[PDB]
Symmetry: D3
Subunit: 134 residues, 6 copies
């Protein structure tokens, strides 16, 4: 029981996901009251780098040259929605890169806050848009 | 604007952490898994291996994570009707807890599952990634 | 005494290599009786990933975007032949990627079985086909 | 407070930098009298590999397929000038790759000699040439 | 033609190393940093994170560097009139000094600063990367 | 479908492993090596450095390999008439044997040799990669 990858213009993919935590934690992330530092900046950077490493992590993904990567945060009362937008010019889509960016930003957020809220959840990681193209 | 926590004045103990997560997919996808009929191959074996390797790569991915000596890593699957539950168990003799590597393994295993199934069910989503247990802490 | 790399369509390279071990070990690999798990699946995945990492490992190799990578096994009585087929579209050949896939699959197989057969050998790693093109 | 990368023919970038050390150390590097081995060969290889890893290291850099990478050394009485020449065909310039090659060669040189000259300095890391193109 | 030094017959002690370096830039660049007006974003936060991660990747980059367990990593900036000083502090409980990781962090943080500012000041340069302190050794 | 072996209930000892391998090439290639006339440069130095670095990257490449603290790594060559023998010696103070890193080093050094010589002799092959010694185990 094994595996095999697939074979071979401008593309875009958007993924999102949610960190669910306490109102205290969300507020510390926003105002930067955490002892470990700025969670949003650290998570943004981690996710951006994780996008580029997708083929390192996910065995059957191809190495693709990404042309731009954005990590955005929408802060609510109890949660933070992470949106990752990835662009490329290659022979295949870039949703995997977007998803991994989302996942690693979320893991990083969690790392920054785990001493304050160890029960924090990472939820609803999904593709929002993909450009064969919907 | 970040400070790694200094673990220098902390003793090494034998630790274990367990994390879980869930891929929400289709009955068809579950079907193709049990039959071994996925286009890309054995999703479960591939994702187990990806989750194990990622556990080790934790400190490379997560900026403020310390480099920890892992003494063991398991990734288990429970396949339901529509869902695939993922459980990662990580063991280490070191200076801080290993819940990050457990979460990373679950996380990369889920991403890898999705890579294997996205052609049959691109609407699948990754849910409920969380710490179950640290050793006493239990959800 | 130093070094320097070379400068700059559709391409394919095939490499093979052989793990030589005991009849007991070959049989455990096939039927999956090993305590560490499925050797073939683990080795296939390791080799596929190693192909993508070739430029990480071999100092003077270029970073190439591979378009497909297959790892195949032919099981005999005493040995396992590993065949790696790599495809790409780039300015240079892909035999190094094929060879490293072969090598790392073989190292992985060995890792899976070393407690059962520590004298197991990795033999006859070679290029079978390269596409300037023979 | 966060970040975001930029979007998207033949290119070249040259960077240099200087290791400043003792006359004794410079001479050992040249004649290869160091216990840890050949410093120039080790540094050349480290820098060449570091060029390829630029996007791994520098968060907002893009993954670019480099087409050639040269690391050269000019040895003086008290110092060693490291010159890195990087070539590519991509949508953006390659000076970051050149700079990182310079930096990691210099760090490696320092690693090779730190037991002999711990006060050794890495100085004047800069872009010499970039090809929008000057 | 190289030999990694054998640290096998050496005891583990609690160690700290400090390294520094300097980015020579423009008053305009300093201005855009204090105002938060750089095109690419927060240079300081980005470079701090890059320096921390690189500290951990030291043995991957530098061929004869041993793999060391880092217990803590700080990257600090002092912004002057025209210059940005970088200081990395590394702590470890291990068999050899941690000055390489400190230098690597300073080094990658400087490269990352330059990446953030090169569009406003491509003539900027990276200067005076050096060991400040090892713990007794002091410059 | 894989389980990393748990080394948690195992003590740390001082260990050494030796592995070997052979590149089967041409008299011409041996000639160009002794004269320093290879197009790509110093094959031996390049491959030694590649073998050392790969030894450290073992647990990144081999899914079920544990992350081990290596205290020393040597790569030696014996150049014969037509062949180049490679020997890797790895030392570590840890919980499991270091034969994988020794084999990986030999392996990547051979691949790197081949990269340096494939333009003169593309028919060269890599042979007889094996464990020689673990410390008592001896082939």
């Amino acid at each position: 029981g094994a595996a095999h990858m697939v074979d071979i213009t401008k593309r875009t993919a958007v993924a999102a996901g949610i960190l669910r935590t306490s109102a205290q934690v969300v507020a510390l992330i926003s105002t930067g009251g955490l002892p470990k530092g700025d969670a949003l900046a650290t998570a943004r950077v981690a996710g951006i780098m994780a996008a580029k490493r997708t083929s390192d992590l996910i065995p059957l993904c191809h190495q693709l040259a990404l042309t731009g990567v954005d990590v955005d945060f929408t802060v609510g009362q109890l949660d933070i929605e992470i949106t990752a937008t990835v662009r490329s010019t290659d022979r295949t889509g870039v949703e995997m890169e977007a998803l991994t960016a989302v996942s690693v930003a979320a893991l990083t957020l969690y790392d920054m806050i785990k001493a304050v809220d160890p029960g924090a959840l990472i939820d609803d990681i999904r593709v929002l848009h993909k450009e064969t193209r919907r």
